[model samples]
Target chain A: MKTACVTGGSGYIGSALIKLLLEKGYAVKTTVRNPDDMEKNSHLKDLQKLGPLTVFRADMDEEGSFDDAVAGCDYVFLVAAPLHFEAQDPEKEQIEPAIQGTLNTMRSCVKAGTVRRVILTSSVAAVYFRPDLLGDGHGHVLDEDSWSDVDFLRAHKPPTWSHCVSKVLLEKEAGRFAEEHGISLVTILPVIVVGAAPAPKARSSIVDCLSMLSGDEAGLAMLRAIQKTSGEVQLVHVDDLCRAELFLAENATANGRYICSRYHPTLVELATFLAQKYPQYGVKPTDFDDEERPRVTMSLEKLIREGFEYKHNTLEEIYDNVVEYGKALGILPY
Target chain B: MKTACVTGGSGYIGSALIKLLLEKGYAVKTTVRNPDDMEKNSHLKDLQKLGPLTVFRADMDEEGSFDDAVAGCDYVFLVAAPLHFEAQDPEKEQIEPAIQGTLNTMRSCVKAGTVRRVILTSSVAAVYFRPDLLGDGHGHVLDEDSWSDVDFLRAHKPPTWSHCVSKVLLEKEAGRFAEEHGISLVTILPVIVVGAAPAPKARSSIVDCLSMLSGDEAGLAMLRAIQKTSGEVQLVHVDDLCRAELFLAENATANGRYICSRYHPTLVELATFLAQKYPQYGVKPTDFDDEERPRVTMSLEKLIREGFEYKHNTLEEIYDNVVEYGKALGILPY
Candidate 1:
């Protein structure tokens, strides 16, 4: 089996992608904070039954933590969140880790010399933000050329903008390293992924935003703030996101950034569907029009044109699978 | 005379610097919207007698608008808002133009391999803006290694911070393109520039604010609001800024970013000096204690170590020359 190593494999997309890779018969090495920690490595243990699986400890901030796994791998998927989000202190939590982690990870990839491709999981936050696109005019679509003005967003930091900035810088620096080292690098700038968590804390950003409805007043406020960007948001199912990651990793000519949004849905439409279809969770429906509209809708033409097809192509299917998995994982109270 | 291309030459720093360039006997090519529009190129025409001069039309958003001017030029100075209290549509006015404009300019430079070095005019806004740095420790001095936690600034969109964001991104993209193309790139991150304006609207950021005091309520409000950031701001005379720009351009080995601040003055100190010196202009003594203190004080060690010297090293001198020119130009009251 071709060897593949994944960082942050215990988390949402990482876990989902790992499962797909196992089924595809790749010898997978996944990184967790501690290989001996049962809680984090438990999900990877289940994957071992299907195919070759190994667990490694990779701290993003720690120097050379990824060396053991990436040494002879055919591919490396750096899906790790180099930093955790801290509302109070962002520099320590978001900026340093994302930048340092990427540099460290890329350095190991270059040091290994045997890793054929490095697939980076970057967010749409790295691509474009709605605020910077507002009132700009039509045709401001998010494509490979688009870069979310992290500096512009930094000045008027709405909540969660720090994480956006982290991703933006991370992706840019990653691109720089790839060119400098002459490595085959592909980046997936995924839109909001509506996926179930492997564990409670491993929820995707969109799922976490949606789950805010079940929390306290602060969580509800965050949910509302996030929902406000709905009209211009894009969606990608976890499975499809994984497939795209795989597709780019396997393709010899695939290089540069690939935007990974599967189906387009307005935030209001997603909320309305959630409120009616999964009302058991007490998802409230109200006026979301007061929320800001995004200036640019994302373009997946490059991804599609590259001969990649979405596994979950319909919006309803994406939502159905997400909620079903959310309920199964006990993330949804219903 | 050695040729140089200066983008945004019709504006504040560009026009002023062009005069100095002519004095230095360098043939300068400045970009304006329309080379034929005599009103825009009128000031540049005066520099014609000093050295070989030319004007080219360059738009930041256009693909190859900078090709003609950049083609045969030995150096290019991209001093381009390329802002402000515009709340409703900042994205259009501030963000996109600055970023897209920088990329376009760099692309032109890279395409024309004859360009030796591209000196970018960045700002301290690209360096540090931690409001949290207010009233902090003695460790906040800014040097070559500082990058403003744009994510931090994003949370507090203080007045005129968007332009700060623009400069920050512009400098970064410029740096990236330079490294990729194997071209030398030097960026000058001056704090607040205090100098004469070529036109009423072309005054340096600080000069514009200071000039307001001898005029009107909007001016006072701007002073109070801008004063909020006075404690940590740095000042560079337009002459010093121009010299710094030229020093890097001519110095073959000079590469990377340089922070170009001559002296550090609290907003109150500068304000008091302005009030005392220009009392005839109805200058008022005001308490600026509540203003934000800068976390990082800029260190000019790099420039000094590199043998670059400032022509105006004192605050009094910078203020004097700026106001004298401002008065002569009728930007300030006689």
Candidate 2:
């Protein structure tokens, strides 16, 4: 069996990636900060029944912590990062660990010369935050070439500054390091990843996706910030993101950053769809009448041109999956 | 007597400001993180003997912590901020406290209601970091109107990114708050403040200034990074900075940000000056042959036009004072 190492095995994306990797008959080695924390890792334990799965206790802050898990692997998927919207010190709590962990993992991959390619899970947070694009009247289409301005985020210090800063820095640094070491590194910048995980949990994006229905004040505030800053709500299903990671790792020409978003909906459009599709949730389209429609849209041309297909393409399919998952997880009362 | 509150009474600038405030016959109230830490605050105790000085315990992270010190003060000087060039987590260790502390002190000033003008001790870090100005052939003159691009800082993340980010954000936020609350807020952006404090203890700027002479690798590396990013070394005497703070506070029309830098020396110019003046330190002009001359200069026209005078206006005067203090503190062998 082909061997692959996936970091952050217990996270929303990591758990989904692990199941897909195992189902695809790859012998998966994954790292969790603490394997002993059964509350987080219990799902990983359940995934072992699918195929050969090895769990390693590793930390991103510690150098070479991922060496054991990545050794002799044909592919490495770096998905572990601290995801937080607000922090007392975002630089310390979020950015440092995210950047250091990425560099450490890349170093491990370099040490394990057998690894063929590394797929980095960066976020759309890395691609947005362009002040030049806002209110220009001519709506801009953001793609892989677009990068979130680190300086802009630092100056504005929006709710998502830490996460955006961490992703942008790590992605740039990782790419530089990979080039210097002659390692094939491909980054996937997914926007607002949705869809059901094997074990549904209250992930930030998922919670924010259903915030209107659930009346989650914090989630709604985050969504407002995202709308104000990013100008639109772009999304990709978890399955699509995982599939793209695999596709890029296997594809010969897969290179640089690939934006993996499938759906781009304005807040008003999103509210209209959610309210119409599921009237039981009481999502009001009129509530977002004051909301500004984004002049920019995220383009999936690069990811689509690579022969990678998204399983959940439309808002209906994406929200249906998420709403079911939300209900199952008890995040939604309906 | 007019009462003035100076936050960060134990800091290099804070201590100097306190001494000057006492010398000016103003009743001073100061806040130290810990007054009992004699190693840090012993100088403050000495300053108390100069005038009616009171030290209060305050933390930036704790909201309203500066209330007791700021209460009933006529003028407030916010000079306390974390000054490390290197941090494990710059956001957590440096930026968060710098920003929170500034805001907390501002909030206290607002609560006090008796404060007339607040002088914020921001750094030139808040003014520099413009990529557009570099290598443009025509040198740019940065003035009070110039603001550091936070986006650029986050992208490149120079060694001083945290400090630069903190200062930029806090100054902008503070200015906005001050304007909304109808408080007269004047910010002083000094560059590489160098001069003798009463105790002549080691400060980051002072250490970096004499790093070449002392052969301090860490300090030299920071200087190199500063030279690489900032292009030139800018210096302001602590006495001059403190004087400007007082001048701005007392002046009826002192408004907005004022650049308080006195000396702008190229690395070669600094090296040559040091070599000829301090031959015992074994300085060499040839050592800086590879250093790039800065294409920009910081303007002090605003301050100078406002009748503010700099005592240490040349490199010779600034270095003589610093070297003397360095020797006194045992930071130099000669």
By TM-score, the best candidate is 2
lDDT of 2 by residue, A214-289 (tens): 9899878777766765556787888888999999999998889898887655566578777766899878776764
Top model number, lDDT: 2
Where in model 1 is the C-alpha error above 4 Å?
A130-132, A137-139, A197-201, A212-230, A287-295, B1-334
Q: What share of the true interface contacts does candidate 1 keep?
A: 0.00
Q: Per-prediction DockQ scores?
A: 0.01, 0.01
Clashes of each: 6, 4
- Each prediction's TM-score against the native? 0.48, 0.49
Q: Could you give the TM-score of chain B for each candidate, in order?
A: 0.87, 0.92
Model 1 scores what on Cα lDDT?
A: 0.71
Q: Least lDDT summed over 10 consecutive residues: which range in candidate 1 chain A?
A: A287-296
Candidate 2 chain B worst ten-residue window by lDDT: B288-297
DockQ-based CAPRI category assigned to the predicted complex of candidate 2: incorrect
